PDB file of N, CA and C in Angstrom:
ATOM      1  N   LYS A  21       0.909  -1.127   0.001  1.00  0.00           N
ATOM      2  CA  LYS A  21      -0.032  -0.081   0.059  1.00  0.00           C
ATOM      3  C   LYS A  21       0.776   1.216  -0.072  1.00  0.00           C
ATOM      4  N   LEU A  22       2.172   1.111   0.033  1.00  0.00           N
ATOM      5  CA  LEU A  22       3.122   2.189   0.057  1.00  0.00           C
ATOM      6  C   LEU A  22       2.903   3.137  -1.004  1.00  0.00           C
ATOM      7  N   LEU A  23       2.576   2.617  -2.269  1.00  0.00           N
ATOM      8  CA  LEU A  23       2.530   3.388  -3.516  1.00  0.00           C
ATOM      9  C   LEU A  23       1.358   4.427  -3.275  1.00  0.00           C
ATOM     10  N   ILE A  24       0.375   4.098  -2.395  1.00  0.00           N
ATOM     11  CA  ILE A  24      -0.629   4.962  -2.181  1.00  0.00           C
ATOM     12  C   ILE A  24      -0.628   5.757  -0.858  1.00  0.00           C
ATOM     13  N   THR A  25       0.188   5.053   0.050  1.00  0.00           N
ATOM     14  CA  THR A  25       0.430   5.905   1.365  1.00  0.00           C
ATOM     15  C   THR A  25       1.216   7.083   1.465  1.00  0.00           C
ATOM     16  N   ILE A  26       1.929   7.262   0.222  1.00  0.00           N
ATOM     17  CA  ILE A  26       2.741   8.489   0.035  1.00  0.00           C
ATOM     18  C   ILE A  26       1.916   9.660   0.101  1.00  0.00           C
ATOM     19  N   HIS A  27       0.719   9.598  -0.613  1.00  0.00           N
ATOM     20  CA  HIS A  27      -0.168  10.673  -0.634  1.00  0.00           C
ATOM     21  C   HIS A  27      -0.756  10.980   0.745  1.00  0.00           C
ATOM     22  N   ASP A  28      -0.941   9.966   1.450  1.00  0.00           N
ATOM     23  CA  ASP A  28      -1.537  10.110   2.653  1.00  0.00           C
ATOM     24  C   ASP A  28      -0.498  10.428   3.799  1.00  0.00           C
ATOM     25  N   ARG A  29       0.739  10.140   3.452  1.00  0.00           N
ATOM     26  CA  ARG A  29       1.876  10.425   4.291  1.00  0.00           C
ATOM     27  C   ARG A  29       2.032  11.929   4.403  1.00  0.00           C
ATOM     28  N   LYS A  30       1.964  12.573   3.323  1.00  0.00           N
ATOM     29  CA  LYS A  30       2.060  13.988   3.383  1.00  0.00           C
ATOM     30  C   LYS A  30       0.730  14.649   4.101  1.00  0.00           C
ATOM     31  N   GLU A  31      -0.517  14.046   3.709  1.00  0.00           N
ATOM     32  CA  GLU A  31      -1.726  14.554   4.212  1.00  0.00           C
ATOM     33  C   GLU A  31      -1.878  14.054   5.737  1.00  0.00           C
ATOM     34  N   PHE A  32      -2.071  12.800   5.882  1.00  0.00           N
ATOM     35  CA  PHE A  32      -2.382  12.329   7.270  1.00  0.00           C
ATOM     36  C   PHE A  32      -1.196  12.179   8.106  1.00  0.00           C
ATOM     37  N   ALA A  33      -0.073  11.338   7.606  1.00  0.00           N
ATOM     38  CA  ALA A  33       1.147  10.917   8.408  1.00  0.00           C
ATOM     39  C   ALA A  33       1.826  12.263   8.957  1.00  0.00           C
ATOM     40  N   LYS A  34       1.774  13.314   8.247  1.00  0.00           N
ATOM     41  CA  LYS A  34       2.377  14.523   8.784  1.00  0.00           C
ATOM     42  C   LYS A  34       1.807  14.925  10.130  1.00  0.00           C
ATOM     43  N   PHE A  35       0.572  14.597  10.348  1.00  0.00           N
ATOM     44  CA  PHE A  35      -0.093  14.728  11.493  1.00  0.00           C
ATOM     45  C   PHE A  35       0.547  13.968  12.700  1.00  0.00           C
ATOM     46  N   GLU A  36       0.610  12.694  12.360  1.00  0.00           N
ATOM     47  CA  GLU A  36       1.024  11.728  13.537  1.00  0.00           C
ATOM     48  C   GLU A  36       2.563  11.951  13.749  1.00  0.00           C
ATOM     49  N   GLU A  37       3.212  12.296  12.556  1.00  0.00           N
ATOM     50  CA  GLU A  37       4.646  12.390  12.576  1.00  0.00           C
ATOM     51  C   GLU A  37       5.193  13.407  13.610  1.00  0.00           C
ATOM     52  N   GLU A  38       4.333  14.406  13.946  1.00  0.00           N
ATOM     53  CA  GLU A  38       4.650  15.462  14.907  1.00  0.00           C
ATOM     54  C   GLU A  38       4.895  14.703  16.277  1.00  0.00           C
ATOM     55  N   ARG A  39       4.113  13.901  16.728  1.00  0.00           N
ATOM     56  CA  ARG A  39       4.280  13.167  18.002  1.00  0.00           C
ATOM     57  C   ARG A  39       5.093  11.995  17.843  1.00  0.00           C
ATOM     58  N   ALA A  40       4.993  11.318  16.720  1.00  0.00           N
ATOM     59  CA  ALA A  40       5.688  10.198  16.275  1.00  0.00           C
ATOM     60  C   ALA A  40       7.132  10.307  16.328  1.00  0.00           C
ATOM     61  N   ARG A  41       7.641  11.417  15.654  1.00  0.00           N
ATOM     62  CA  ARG A  41       9.094  11.748  15.440  1.00  0.00           C
ATOM     63  C   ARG A  41       9.457  12.369  16.752  1.00  0.00           C
ATOM     64  N   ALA A  42       8.617  12.783  17.562  1.00  0.00           N
ATOM     65  CA  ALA A  42       8.922  13.454  18.908  1.00  0.00           C
ATOM     66  C   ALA A  42       9.484  12.486  19.873  1.00  0.00           C
ATOM     67  N   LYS A  43       9.134  11.122  19.588  1.00  0.00           N
ATOM     68  CA  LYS A  43       9.569  10.128  20.610  1.00  0.00           C
ATOM     69  C   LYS A  43      10.192   9.005  19.807  1.00  0.00           C
ATOM     70  N   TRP A  44       9.856   8.724  18.496  1.00  0.00           N
ATOM     71  CA  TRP A  44      10.324   7.815  17.680  1.00  0.00           C
ATOM     72  C   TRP A  44      10.958   8.413  16.447  1.00  0.00           C
ATOM     73  N   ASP A  45      11.655   9.367  16.646  1.00  0.00           N
ATOM     74  CA  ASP A  45      12.383  10.026  15.469  1.00  0.00           C
ATOM     75  C   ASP A  45      12.950   9.084  14.576  1.00  0.00           C
ATOM     76  N   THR A  46      13.771   8.151  15.214  1.00  0.00           N
ATOM     77  CA  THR A  46      14.615   7.216  14.425  1.00  0.00           C
ATOM     78  C   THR A  46      13.733   6.047  13.905  1.00  0.00           C
ATOM     79  N   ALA A  47      12.622   5.795  14.509  1.00  0.00           N
ATOM     80  CA  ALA A  47      11.703   4.692  14.149  1.00  0.00           C
ATOM     81  C   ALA A  47      10.765   4.981  12.993  1.00  0.00           C
ATOM     82  N   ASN A  48      10.305   6.322  12.996  1.00  0.00           N
ATOM     83  CA  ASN A  48       9.391   6.721  11.884  1.00  0.00           C
ATOM     84  C   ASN A  48      10.124   7.402  10.843  1.00  0.00           C
ATOM     85  N   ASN A  49      11.201   7.862  11.168  1.00  0.00           N
ATOM     86  CA  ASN A  49      11.838   8.670  10.046  1.00  0.00           C
ATOM     87  C   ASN A  49      13.447   8.116  10.084  1.00  0.00           C
ATOM     88  N   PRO A  50      13.962   8.228   8.751  1.00  0.00           N
ATOM     89  CA  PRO A  50      15.357   7.743   8.663  1.00  0.00           C
ATOM     90  C   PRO A  50      16.539   8.716   8.976  1.00  0.00           C
ATOM     91  N   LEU A  51      15.946  10.003   9.023  1.00  0.00           N
ATOM     92  CA  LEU A  51      16.803  11.078   9.282  1.00  0.00           C
ATOM     93  C   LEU A  51      16.149  12.252   9.686  1.00  0.00           C
ATOM     94  N   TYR A  52      15.048  12.549   9.041  1.00  0.00           N
ATOM     95  CA  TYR A  52      14.225  13.579   9.407  1.00  0.00           C
ATOM     96  C   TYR A  52      12.923  13.438   8.610  1.00  0.00           C
ATOM     97  N   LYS A  53      12.991  13.241   7.356  1.00  0.00           N
ATOM     98  CA  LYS A  53      12.137  12.918   6.655  1.00  0.00           C
ATOM     99  C   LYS A  53      12.642  11.953   5.597  1.00  0.00           C
ATOM    100  N   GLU A  54      11.839  11.472   4.623  1.00  0.00           N
ATOM    101  CA  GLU A  54      12.334  10.547   3.569  1.00  0.00           C
ATOM    102  C   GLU A  54      13.073  11.135   2.409  1.00  0.00           C
ATOM    103  N   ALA A  55      12.535  12.322   1.982  1.00  0.00           N
ATOM    104  CA  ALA A  55      13.011  12.923   0.921  1.00  0.00           C
ATOM    105  C   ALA A  55      14.456  13.677   1.292  1.00  0.00           C
ATOM    106  N   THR A  56      14.725  13.786   2.627  1.00  0.00           N
ATOM    107  CA  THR A  56      15.752  14.410   2.971  1.00  0.00           C
ATOM    108  C   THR A  56      17.142  13.573   2.588  1.00  0.00           C
ATOM    109  N   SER A  57      16.996  12.239   2.453  1.00  0.00           N
ATOM    110  CA  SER A  57      18.040  11.454   2.130  1.00  0.00           C
ATOM    111  C   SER A  57      18.185  11.508   0.610  1.00  0.00           C
ATOM    112  N   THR A  58      16.991  11.264  -0.249  1.00  0.00           N
ATOM    113  CA  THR A  58      17.211  11.163  -1.659  1.00  0.00           C
ATOM    114  C   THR A  58      17.468  12.517  -2.396  1.00  0.00           C
ATOM    115  N   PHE A  59      16.948  13.632  -1.745  1.00  0.00           N
ATOM    116  CA  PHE A  59      17.185  14.902  -2.221  1.00  0.00           C
ATOM    117  C   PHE A  59      18.020  15.856  -1.294  1.00  0.00           C
ATOM    118  N   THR A  60      18.543  16.913  -1.806  1.00  0.00           N
ATOM    119  CA  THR A  60      19.510  17.717  -1.285  1.00  0.00           C
ATOM    120  C   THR A  60      18.663  18.962  -0.508  1.00  0.00           C
ATOM    121  N   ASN A  61      17.877  19.635  -1.271  1.00  0.00           N
ATOM    122  CA  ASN A  61      17.046  20.560  -0.859  1.00  0.00           C
ATOM    123  C   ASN A  61      15.674  20.673  -1.517  1.00  0.00           C
ATOM    124  N   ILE A  62      14.545  20.442  -0.684  1.00  0.00           N
ATOM    125  CA  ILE A  62      13.157  20.536  -1.101  1.00  0.00           C
ATOM    126  C   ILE A  62      12.361  21.258  -0.198  1.00  0.00           C
ATOM    127  N   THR A  63      11.372  22.103  -0.695  1.00  0.00           N
ATOM    128  CA  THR A  63      10.416  22.867   0.213  1.00  0.00           C
ATOM    129  C   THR A  63       9.543  21.861   1.039  1.00  0.00           C
ATOM    130  N   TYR A  64       9.028  20.755   0.459  1.00  0.00           N
ATOM    131  CA  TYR A  64       8.301  19.835   1.223  1.00  0.00           C
ATOM    132  C   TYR A  64       9.060  19.044   1.877  1.00  0.00           C
ATOM    133  N   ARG A  65      10.294  18.726   1.540  1.00  0.00           N
ATOM    134  CA  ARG A  65      11.348  17.891   2.249  1.00  0.00           C
ATOM    135  C   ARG A  65      10.807  16.421   2.482  1.00  0.00           C
ATOM    136  N   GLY A  66       9.783  16.183   1.833  1.00  0.00           N
ATOM    137  CA  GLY A  66       9.185  14.825   1.902  1.00  0.00           C
ATOM    138  C   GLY A  66       8.337  14.601   0.702  1.00  0.00           C
ATOM    139  N   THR A  67       8.460  15.312  -0.289  1.00  0.00           N
ATOM    140  CA  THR A  67       7.690  15.132  -1.319  1.00  0.00           C
ATOM    141  C   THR A  67       7.929  13.883  -2.147  1.00  0.00           C
TER     142      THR A  67
END
């Protein structure tokens, strides 16, 4: 469902990510965001 969760990741997940990455930064996120690794500078940073 990952192919589809991307869209809900920015919509929904961004919500949970606030508290999620607040406690499980390394569990939910690989660095900060996902696009932080594959890209160098992006405004969404998770696009």
